[PDB]
Design an enzyme around this catalytic site. Structure first.
Site, PDB file in Angstrom:
ATOM      1  CB  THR A  96      -5.503  -3.705  10.028  1.00 14.94           C
ATOM      2  OG1 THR A  96      -5.041  -4.386  10.821  1.00 14.94           O
ATOM      3  CG2 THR A  96      -6.157  -4.145   9.328  1.00 14.94           C
ATOM      4  CB  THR A  97      -1.696   0.594   8.665  1.00 11.74           C
ATOM      5  OG1 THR A  97      -2.354   0.134   7.068  1.00 11.74           O
ATOM      6  CG2 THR A  97      -0.723   1.206   9.013  1.00 11.74           C
TER       7      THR A  97
END
Lengths: 241, 241, 249, 250, 244, 234, 249, 242
Positions: free
Chosen positions: E34-35
């Site tokens: 995930t960012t």
């Protein structure tokens, strides 16, 4: 662990560890081919349905309920300058049944290829109902196939005695035959494969539908056959939960 | 390339070579950073090229020059993780030497100690060499200014002046030409600022490029202490020359 | 999409792509090579029956002993490799004696079976965080019978996988499938000691290649009154004769 | 389990040969030539000091090291292995002999200890065999002068004169044609210089040659005066000026 | 060259080019996480995480993506959850030990160095594998605000703005744009708004998402790490929506 | 095919950045039976469907009590399940005896994560292949935790794991607000859990021998009903 | 007039290169016929198509499956290419495969060229046939006109051949055959040194080297490399990574 | 096969191939026969042809006296047998010291089997390639005891057992000539039976047969020339039958 052994490097997986036929690895000569002999008194036209499978699918064919009877056997021989195995053929109702015993330790795939070729050649004269039951280790879920539609995913494929039978039915010397094939996911080497409870139940249901029997009694007998120390189940009860 | 078990550990090839050590030498020059070390009359100067291709990175946190002890400075060529590991090991070794023998550790002894550790790495199968090249610079009380260098193979040696990096050959040739022209084997400047300016000019001539205050990292070792010059000092040196 | 060899069944600490441990399955396959051992637990006691499969005529009758005495109130039967079974039996006896020493009471059969399963789990991580002591899992299956005040007569099946079950009648060996089917179809809670013994003898004769006789058939009983005992050859011969008489008519 | 042991790194080939030892010998034969010739009143050890980019100080790195005041050694092969072996040999000489009998060990016993260490290296599943060959020259009261060669396998042999490394066969032939039973130390030094002159590809001066002699006692190198019984070191290292003066002369 | 055959089955093996392929495979595993982004304002550090809306059965109270190490240290990571959680636990132990010894909160550079050493120590032997997480952490100490990012190789660097995960690249560009729009400095509230804007710009994958923003500033949180309250969080969400 | 070259141990990463042994351990969960857990505000309930080898065998002990305020149900490998159950029992006893404090549910989840993450990064050990559903009550109220053997712990109002658990999970998510407000009446919560677990049945029905229930609450210590005790709940 | 025959070797680089060869330009290649596979472990699989969205090689619409041993034909340049999925049964059946399967195919279509692609593992080099490990690939040529009755001649590449290698037996059977075609003129052998693993890029580079060397007379250059869709399933499910939310995030 | 390169790997059919290979190594050595009489035990061994330049004064005996009442014979590798015999003697003396009672035959056989089993529990050791026959009498009665121990650690009780090369012929001869109902009452009958069994595979019985006799009260007498007399008498009786 402080370390792992430096020399523990796996061998390349390109070549299988299939059993050896001749001890001469530098023969530089043509190897003899196994000979298969199909009984001449089987009376094929008396039966309008033949089922080709292996021993692992024995629970799908209860003995007492289906009234299994013995007629004849296929004799396979090979001479090396010695291999011989018996292939009994069963009959329930008016339907014949071939259940080859695969063993990747002691039985080479060449015997299976010869047996499949002989069976397809003998059964193609009259073209009865052809039902293929087997397992593949490359399929995510259960697959149902016919001579017109292929439901296999592009990566998935079928290999082994069932694969040999399907190859002989599709691109073999005898073509145009109609067959229904049921493939279930499995794990393990040839002759020692294992299934799961859901896959076993699905196979039982589809076999009962394609054979015309009451689901209740058929399912009860199949479950009793599965749970009676069958080699296909393995250690599901003893390893999980 | 390697062939056999001599791909994961350090054992002799059929040609009598250790491939892992050579590959660590290859890994040393993967940072694309060149460093220079020159000893003056009473000082030693190390100058490392500083590259900041990303403007999202804080320039003040980028440094390959470490202060091992009061008098010894170190410059590492290679990846920064092994650089920091070697820096901590060198700090511990210098402190232990001072505790055990009652006097400060000279540069050559520390270089030999690190080289012995590298030899341990190159002979033990389950240990790997550190892909870094270490350069210790100091002003020893018995030998004056001193520059020593050690490599992953376990080889250490002292230099009148040294250059390292992918473009080390041009800098080395220019240094040899300057030494032949002067024939005093060191730098005649009596101030460390002049030695830093000379090193900056030599690096500019060798690399054929002009640097800013943020493109250089300078460390100076004197008789009493080793200190790393800040951005303002490098800018003052650039403005002077 | 090519046929390549798969090596997920080599290492013990390796999962199959669907999450299976093939070494335990191979151990069960090895257990299947052992002789047939049957155990029936009724309200009148527990009966164990084994086949003394003699590979040579000159082999001693008393040489093969697959029915042992873990404790006066706990008997055992084994199927598979004898080497691992020896250590398992010794550990079970040690645990029973230690429990008797430190508690002045007989150990429950379930506790002993759990201890044996904990020992069999040693090929991986221990139950109490103990390290590994076995390079491979066991290749023996155990049928443990006993009597205690908590659960009356107890019969348990213990596997090398470390999981044990409680069975009213359990048979494992070479002829495991047929004996298990016969037990499933021919068992009821009203079986007496004599009826259970005769059923064991009949199933053994069914699953034996050779003719049934006391030389290759050992019967043992465990009851509350007399603890665990093993029938001699004369009593087994009398039981076989009575079974023949009752099957004739 | 699979962590308390390691398989042997050195194993026999089907022909009956140890591959790692042969590869170590091959690595040695690729190193710089080092030679040693024994005279009737001394032993001469010589080697070529190959250098990196001409900015390093050749005096800092010495390929000839004093083991004991009467025993010195030179090597062909890998530098760090030689350095480690030299440190271990000095420590063993002090622990096994000096602290027990009050005397430095004879040449043969120190060579035997080094050979034992190397053999233990070749018999281990955690380390590879050493990649050096050692020429050890010494003197002792009851055996005079001695010169020995130690291989990576741990086998040591006496020698009247020998050479190892790249130019070993030609050097061996030249020394065989040159050595005689009546040779003296100066003649041995001259022959060693002549042998080295045929193997150096660069400048043949005193800056690229390392030479040591097991000759007579040196009271000036002892460091103190006052004990007539005590004797100076019998191992001496020739300086660059002396080597140059010998090169200019015969 | 991204697949080095024959030199990628062991942790501590050099390839003929001089590269460690297990470390690069761990980096590839990080790239699928995930960012997560982090910004450094004038006197504080802001962390932002774009989380995927999971099943409603989860308790929306006890589930927090951003991890807390110490009162002045905030940390987020992208990669494998167990490895990141273990690294956070190790960082907590290190901070506790330093505070217990020297009676002061551990300075951020020292904490970063200890974490980097611990991570690098896992690339030295063939019996362990490198961590598959990239960690963006930061805080405030006597010298000011510090923000660092640590790679699976054990290399860490101080960043004005850091981004990791699937939508890293564009996010980095946005971060660069931030430096090209506020060179002189940035406030904490503007940092929160820009973090929300960047997360909204870089989450265009589709599956609804949620934003988690935390900050630690001297002039806004008394040098402590706190999550953004509901009012300011909703304001940041509205600003991000309006900017698009 | 290319996966077969990078799935030998837990130390090997694929070129695409995967850890296949942990994935196989996670896939080993579905080979076990289905267990459901749910809590509203004051009571936590686990429902388990037990399995037997055959007619004559007993039924697997799906639910094992860990402490007077904490229990769990297991789905997956029996050895790993037993190891983790014994570990949790030892941890609860250790906390009570050393700290004079009852072990928290979150602390137990953290301990399980710490123990599970170690086997996923070191050679010589096999990752755990059993998922756990833990119910407890402490000073912060009632808690339900789902432990994934990869080393993950999640806190949720309700969930279900095992074979065919998707239907039960969908039913729980759809009717989340119906049972989340059941306060003070544990029987309704137990019946809701039984109805949820009945959705995963396939050609089978709940009986008196294959159903087990576990309940913990504020004033209710952790208790387990099995056999005739669940006959009132069908 | 030129035949390409891959061999089941280390890393399956030849076979994968075949998949690189056919699927890179599917316009010029069509399915021709399935050979007899009594000496193989022949499988049954579905059709395969290029990823870029081109028509499948199997022009006939009445075939939905596939076999192991197949032959595709290029009529534009007259090239026969063989594809195998399952490995040859044992190693002593190579002679039968050569003299009973591909022997009729030779002189069945009057082929004037043979090309053999192989990959050798440098660790198992028992006979030391490798003399210059600096290079990776190797080429050998043989002409019937220039030779009457080891036996090959190699270009200045990495490396005679070992007797145990399959190439030696293939050459021996081809030369010594009493049913050899009269149109067979040239035999060429391309070999590569590589390890086992994800050999997709290795196969691509090997095919690039083969095309550059112009070993095949009518081999056009490839400007766009397109993989078959089946290679998307090499690692398993396409969305398998998304499934493990608890493991990847 | 792929399942035969370690001792900790199970084969799909349920076999350990390293144990089978150790058994094959055992079946490569000289033969060894053990026969149980009514009140005596006889151990026979086959000696390979003695070379002309071999010292026969101190040639080792194939039968080793572990204790004053227990003897041991082996088949397979000689040095591994020496190691096992040394350990067995040490254990017998240790047991006698600890419990004041000399070891029983079954206890010593169990200890030997336990050592052979322990040497199969690690991947860094090679199991002994020796199959042993342990004979004797318990030191409290007159009951003969004969045991066979295998490399895998399995021990069994026999009345007449042959181990080694060409043991099938001797085993068949014992099966066709030995009856447990009527074991040889006297020592002479048992010795003659053992010699005749050994002659079925021994080319020359005058110089390749070794006979040891164990009797109660811990006597143990090894026969010298007398074996030649037995061979000559057997040949004479056989020719008389002809």
């Amino acid at each position: 662990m402080l370390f792992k052994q430096w020399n523990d490097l796996p061998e390349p997986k390109h070549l299988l560890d299939l059993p050896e036929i001749s001890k001469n690895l530098q023969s530089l000569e043509v190897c003899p081919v196994p000979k298969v002999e199909f009984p001449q008194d089987l009376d094929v036209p008396q039966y309008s349905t033949a089922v080709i499978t292996t021993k692992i699918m024995n629970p799908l064919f209860p003995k007492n309920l289906l009234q299994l009877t013995s007629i004849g056997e296929i004799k396979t021989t090979l001479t090396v300058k010695v291999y011989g195995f018996s292939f009994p053929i069963y009959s329930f109702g008016k339907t014949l049944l071939f259940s080859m015993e695969e063993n990747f330790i002691s039985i080479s795939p060449i015997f299976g290829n010869m047996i499949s070729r002989s069976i397809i050649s003998q059964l193609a004269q009259f073209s009865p109902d052809i039902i293929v039951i087997g397992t593949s280790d490359k399929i995510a879920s259960m697959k149902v196939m016919t001579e017109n539609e292929c439901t296999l995913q592009p990566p998935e494929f079928i290999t082994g005695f069932i694969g040999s039978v399907l190859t002989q039915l599709i691109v073999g010397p005898s073509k145009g035959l109609k067959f229904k094939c049921l493939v279930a996911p499995s794990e393990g080497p040839n002759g020692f494969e294992k299934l799961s409870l859901s896959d076993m139940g699905s196979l039982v249901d589809l076999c009962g539908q394609w054979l015309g029997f009451e689901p209740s009694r058929y399912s009860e007998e199949c479950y009793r056959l599965w749970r009676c120390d069958s080699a296909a189940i393995g250690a599901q009860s003893g390893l999980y939960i | 390339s390697a062939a056999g078990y001599d791909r994961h550990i350090t054992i002799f090839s059929p040609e009598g070579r250790l491939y892992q050590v050579e590959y660590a030498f290859k890994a040393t020059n993967q940072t694309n950073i060149n460093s220079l070390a020159v000893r003056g009359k009473d000082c030693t100067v190390v100058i490392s090229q500083k590259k900041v291709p990303d403007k999202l990175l804080d320039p003040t946190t980028v440094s390959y020059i470490f202060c091992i002890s009061r008098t010894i400075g170190m410059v590492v060529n290679g990846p920064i993780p092994d650089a920091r590991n070697a820096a901590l090991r060198a700090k511990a070794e210098a402190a232990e030497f001072r505790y055990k023998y009652g006097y400060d550790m000279p540069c050559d002894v520390l270089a030999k100690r690190m080289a012995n550790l590298s030899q341990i790495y190159t002979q033990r199968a389950y240990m790997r060499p550190l892909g870094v090249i270490l350069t210790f610079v100091s002003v020893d009380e018995e030998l004056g200014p001193s520059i020593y260098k050690t490599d992953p193979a376990g080889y250490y040696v002292g230099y009148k002046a040294t250059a390292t990096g992918p473009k080390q050959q041009e800098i080395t040739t220019n240094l040899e030409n300057h030494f032949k022209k002067s024939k005093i084997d060191h730098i005649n400047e009596e101030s460390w600022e002049k030695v830093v300016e000379f090193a900056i000019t030599h690096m500019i001539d060798a690399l054929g490029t002009e640097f800013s205050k943020n493109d250089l990292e300078v460390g100076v070792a004197t008789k009493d202490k080793f200190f790393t010059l800040s951005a303002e000092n490098i800018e003052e040196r650039l403005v002077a020359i | 999409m090519f046929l390549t060899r798969s090596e997920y069944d080599r290492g013990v600490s390796t999962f199959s792509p669907e999450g299976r441990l093939f070494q335990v399955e191979y151990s069960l396959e090895a257990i299947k090579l052992g002789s047939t051992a049957i155990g029936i637990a009724t309200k009148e006691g527990v009966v164990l029956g084994v086949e003394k499969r003699a590979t040579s005529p000159l082999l001693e009758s008393d040489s093969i002993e697959k029915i042992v005495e873990i404790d006066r109130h706990i008997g055992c039967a084994m199927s598979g490799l004898t080497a691992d079974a020896r250590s398992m039996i010794e550990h079970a006896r040690t645990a029973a004696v230690t429990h008797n020493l430190y508690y002045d009471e007989d150990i429950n059969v379930e506790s002993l079976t759990q201890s044996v399963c904990d020992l069999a789990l040693r090929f991986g991580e221990g139950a109490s965080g103990e390290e590994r002591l076995m390079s491979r899992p066991f290749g023996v299956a155990l049928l443990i019978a006993g009597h205690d005040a908590d659960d009356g007569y107890q019969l348990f099946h213990a596997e090398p996988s470390g999981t044990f079950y409680r069975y009213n009648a359990k048979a494992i060996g070479s002829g495991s499938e047929g004996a298990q089917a016969e037990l499933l179809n021919e068992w009821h809670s009203s079986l007496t000691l004599k009826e259970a013994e005769l059923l064991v003898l009949k199933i053994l004769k069914q699953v034996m290649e050779e003719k049934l006789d006391e030389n290759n058939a050992q019967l043992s009983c465990i009851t509350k009154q007399d603890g665990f005992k093993i029938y001699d050859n004369e009593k087994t011969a009398e039981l076989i004769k009575e079974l023949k008489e009752k099957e004739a008519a | 389990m699979t962590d308390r042991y390691s398989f042997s790194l050195t194993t026999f080939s089907p022909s009956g040969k140890l591959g790692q030892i042969d590869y170590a010998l091959t690595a040695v034969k690729q190193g710089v030539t080092s030679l040693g010739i024994k005279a009737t009143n001394g032993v001469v050890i010589a080697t070529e000091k190959k250098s990196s980019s001409p900015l390093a100080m050749s005096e800092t790195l010495s390929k000839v090291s004093l083991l004991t005041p009467d025993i010195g050694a030179v090597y062909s092969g890998m530098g760090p292995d030689y350095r480690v072996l030299v440190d271990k040999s000095r420590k063993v000489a002090h622990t096994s002999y000096k602290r027990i009998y009050g005397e430095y060990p004879p040449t043969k016993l120190l060579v035997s200890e080094v050979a034992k260490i190397m053999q233990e290296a070749t018999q281990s599943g955690g380390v590879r065999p050493f990649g050096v060959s050692l020429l050890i020259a010494g003197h002792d009261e009851f055996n005079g002068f001695s010169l020995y060669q130690v291989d990576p396998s741990g086998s040591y042999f006496p020698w009247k004169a020998t050479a190892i490394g790249k130019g070993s066969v030609a050097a061996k032939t030249f020394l065989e044609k040159r050595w005689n039973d009546e040779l003296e130390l100066e003649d041995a030094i001259h022959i060693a210089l002549l042998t080295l002159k045929e193997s150096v590809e660069g400048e043949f001066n005193g800056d690229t040659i390392e030479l040591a002699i097991i000759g007579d006692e040196n009271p000036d190198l002892l460091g103190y005066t006052g004990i007539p019984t005590d004797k100076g070191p019998r191992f001496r290292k020739l300086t660059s000026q002396e080597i140059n003066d010998r090169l200019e002369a015969l | 060259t991204s697949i080095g055959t024959g030199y990628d089955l062991s942790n501590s093996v050099f390839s003929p080019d001089g590269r460690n392929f297990q470390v690069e495979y761990a980096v590839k595993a990080v790239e699928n996480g995930t960012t997560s982004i982090g910004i450094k304002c004038n006197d504080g550090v802001v962390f932002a995480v774009e989380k995927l809306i999971t099943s409603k059965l989860l308790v929306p109270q006890k589930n927090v993506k951003i991890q807390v190490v110490d009162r002045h240290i905030g940390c987020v990571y992208s990669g494998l959850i167990p490895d990141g959680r273990h690294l956070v636990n190790r960082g907590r132990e290190e901070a506790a030990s330093f505070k217990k010894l020297y009676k002061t909160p551990i300075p951020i550079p020292a904490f970063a160095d200890r974490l980097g050493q611990y991570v690098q120590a896992h690339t030295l032997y063939n019996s362990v594998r490198p961590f598959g997480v990239s960690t963006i952490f930061g805080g405030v100490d006597k010298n000011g605000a510090h923000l660092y990012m640590l790679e699976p190789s054990g290399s860490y660097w101080g960043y004005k703005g850091a981004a990791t995960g699937k939508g890293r690249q564009s996010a980095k560009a946005e971060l660069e744009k931030l430096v090209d729009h506020h060179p002189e400095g940035l406030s904490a509230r503007e940092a929160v708004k820009q973090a929300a804007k960047i997360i909204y710009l870089a989450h265009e994958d589709k599956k609804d998402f949620e934003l988690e923003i935390s900050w630690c500033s001297l002039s806004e949180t008394n040098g402590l790490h706190k999550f953004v309250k509901g009012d300011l969080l909703q304001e940041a969400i509205d600003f991000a929506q309006k900017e698009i | 095919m290319f996966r077969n070259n990078y799935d030998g141990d837990t130390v090997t990463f694929s070129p695409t950045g995967r850890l296949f042994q942990v994935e196989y351990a996670l896939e080993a969960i579905k080979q076990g039976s289905v267990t459901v857990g749910l809590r509203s505000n004051t009571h936590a309930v686990l429902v388990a469907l037990k399995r037997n080898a055959d007619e004559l065998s007993s039924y697997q002990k799906k639910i094992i009590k860990c402490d007077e305020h904490m229990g769990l149900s297991l789905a997956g490998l029996a050895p790993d399940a037993r190891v983790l159950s014994n570990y949790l029992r030892q941890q609860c006893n250790y906390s009570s005896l050393v700290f004079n404090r009852k072990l928290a549910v979150e602390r137990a989840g953290h301990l399980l994560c710490d123990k599970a993450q170690k086997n996923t990064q070191s050679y010589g050990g096999r990752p755990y292949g059993v998922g756990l559903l833990i119910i407890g009550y402490d000073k912060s109220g009632a808690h339900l935790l789902e432990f994934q053997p990869s080393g993950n712990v999640t806190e949720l109002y309700g969930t279900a794991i095992g074979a065919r658990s998707q239907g039960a999970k969908t039913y729980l998510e759809r009717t989340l607000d119906t049972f989340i407000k059941i306060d003070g009446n544990p029987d309704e919560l137990i019946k809701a859990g039984v109805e949820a677990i009945s959705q995963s049945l396939r050609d089978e029905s709940l009986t008196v021998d294959n159903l087990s229930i576990a309940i913990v609450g504020k004033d209710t210590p952790f208790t387990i009903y099995d056999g005739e005790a669940v006959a009132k709940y069908i | 007039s030129c035949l390409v025959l891959p061999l089941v070797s280390v890393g399956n680089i030849p076979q994968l290169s075949i998949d690189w060869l056919l699927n890179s330009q599917a316009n010029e290649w069509e399915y021709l016929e399935a050979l007899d596979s009594k000496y193989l472990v022949e499988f049954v699989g579905p059709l395969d198509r290029p990823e870029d969205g081109s028509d499948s090689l199997y022009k006939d619409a009445d075939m939905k499956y596939s076999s192991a041993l197949e032959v595709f034909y290029n009529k534009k340049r007259g090239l026969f290419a063989i594809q195998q999925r399952t490995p040859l049964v044992s190693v002593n059946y190579l002679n039968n495969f050569i003299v009973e399967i591909i022997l009729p195919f030779l002189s069945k279509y009057n082929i004037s060229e043979i090309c053999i692609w192989d990959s050798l593992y440098a660790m198992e080099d028992e006979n030391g046939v490798i003399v210059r490990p600096q290079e990776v690939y190797s080429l050998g040529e043989f002409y019937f006109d220039d030779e009457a009755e080891n036996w090959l001649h190699f270009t200045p590449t990495s490396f005679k051949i070992s007797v145990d290698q399959p190439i030696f037996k293939i050459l021996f059977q081809i030369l010594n055959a009493s049913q050899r075609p009269k149109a067979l003129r040239s035999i060429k052998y391309c070999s590569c040194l590589a390890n086992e693993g994800d050999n997709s890029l290795d196969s691509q580079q090997f095919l690039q080297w083969i095309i550059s060397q112009k070993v095949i007379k009518n081999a056009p250059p490839i400007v766009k490399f397109v993989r078959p869709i089946s290679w998307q399933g090499a690692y398993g499910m396409a969305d398998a990574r998304d499934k493990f939310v608890d493991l990847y995030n | 096969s792929g399942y035969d390169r370690a001792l900790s790997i199970f084969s799909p059919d349920g076999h350990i191939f390293q144990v089978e290979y150790a058994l094959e190594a055992v079946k490569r050595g000289t033969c060894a026969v053990g026969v149980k009489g009514k009140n005596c035990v006889v151990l026979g061994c086959e000696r390979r042809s003695t070379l002309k330049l071999q010292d026969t004064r101190i040639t080792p005996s194939k039968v080793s006296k572990i204790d004053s009442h227990v003897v041991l014979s082996f088949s397979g590798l000689n040095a591994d047998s020496r190691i096992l015999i040394e350990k067995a003697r040490v254990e017998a003396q240790s047991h006698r010291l600890t419990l004041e009672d000399p070891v029983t035959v079954e206890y010593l056989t169990r200890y030997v089997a336990g050592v052979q089993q322990r040497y199969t529990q690690s991947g860094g050791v090679r199991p002994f390639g020796v199959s042993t026959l342990i004979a004797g009498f318990d030191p409290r009665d007159d009951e003969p005891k004969l045991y066979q121990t295998e490399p895998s650690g399995i021990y069994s009780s026999w009345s007449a057992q042959t181990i080694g090369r060409n043991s099938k012929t001797v085993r068949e001869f014992l099966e066709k000539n030995y009856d447990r109902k009527e074991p040889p009452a006297t020592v002479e009958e048992c010795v003659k039976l053992t010699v005749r069994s050994l002659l079925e595979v021994v080319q020359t019985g005058a110089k390749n047969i070794e006979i040891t006799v164990v009797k109660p009260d811990s006597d143990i007498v090894a026969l010298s020339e007398e074996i030649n007399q037995y061979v000559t008498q057997i040949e004479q009786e056989k020719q008389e039958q002809q």
